Amino acid sequence: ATKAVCVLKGDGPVQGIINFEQKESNGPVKVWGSIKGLTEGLHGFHVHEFGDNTAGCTSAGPHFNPLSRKHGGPKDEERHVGDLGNVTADKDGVADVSIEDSVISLSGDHCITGRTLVVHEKADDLGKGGNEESTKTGNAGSRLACGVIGIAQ
Amino acid sequence: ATKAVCVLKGDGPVQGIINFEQKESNGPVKVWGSIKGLTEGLHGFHVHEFGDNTAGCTSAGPHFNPLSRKHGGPKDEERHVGDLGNVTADKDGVADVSIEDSVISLSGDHCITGRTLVVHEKADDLGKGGNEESTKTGNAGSRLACGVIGIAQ
């Protein structure tokens, strides 16, 4: 696939549509779209391992981390595959997403189609938060909204 | 042993959890779950082509038919990869699913992970209905509930 999509929905007002494009299978994935319903500021934006919503966003499980690295920001060398850092919501609760990432893929071993994209409660501390949690999850909080990533047209 | 899962949802009361499992790359895919909120009797059960929920179950597009074949029943040679027949709702609207299919897969050209499972309004006529529509969609009509097929634990 060269296109994927995620419709992000949760228990609250957080909702959004996230588009993925990877026109070259060994090039970067472009991530763009919008999320509304958020508190102002920074929110962690991760790929978790399972496209399982059988019990809400918790059942997506951990970060997508198949190389078993430690948690970082997307620009770190030491990062999970799913560590896509933060989106930023304006004063109106709207987050315009514009990410380019060379670690996630739409195919192969780092393929994220069939897994889950999560927007979290607070900001991802990009591994620099100063406690044990920071280097495992980024302290980003609860899961506000999520959606299994699907093959798009 | 690769596993997949689907949570079905729509604008109405139809809700279900469907599980997929394929022990071996060549082997049969086991499909199993429950669907509630259905009118008693038979409902088309199909894999549609995109994991796109952006406008409800309608985004999911057509049947997953990569081999351009006529619609039939799962038991038929001539069918869509997506053609998993009908599930049966009991008098209380509950469909118990236990299925084994050897044309869908969780890998390869015929992989359904990132695609959409749809439970339809009507019985799918299995291509044995006597009209032009029968042999495209099986006259299963409306999409009651759908969900992107995601990677399970």
From Swiss-Prot, chains A, B:
Its cofactor is Cu cation; Zn(2+). Disulfide bonds join 57-146. A lipid is attached at residue 6 (S-palmitoyl cysteine). It is an enzyme of class 1 (oxidoreductase). GO terms for cellular component: axon cytoplasm; cytoplasm; cytoplasmic vesicle; cytosol; dendrite cytoplasm; dense core granule; extracellular exosome; extracellular region. Its main location: cytoplasm. Coiled coil: none annotated. The modification Phosphoserine is found at residues 98, 102, 105, 107. Changing residue 54 to R: In ALS1; reduces tendency to form fibrillar aggregates. Changing residue 93 to R: In ALS1; 30% of wild-type activity. Changing residue 80 to S: Destabilization of dimer and loss of zinc binding. Gene3D superfamilies: Superoxide dismutase, copper/zinc binding domain. PANTHER family: SUPEROXIDE DISMUTASE CU-ZN -RELATED. The protein (both wild-type and ALS1 variants) has a tendency to form fibrillar aggregates in the absence of the intramolecular disulfide bond or of bound zinc ions. These aggregates may have cytotoxic effects. Zinc binding promotes dimerization and stabilizes the native form. This is Superoxide dismutase [Cu-Zn]. It comes from Homo sapiens (Human). The lineage of its organism: Eukaryota, Metazoa, Chordata, Craniata, Vertebrata. The gene is SOD1.
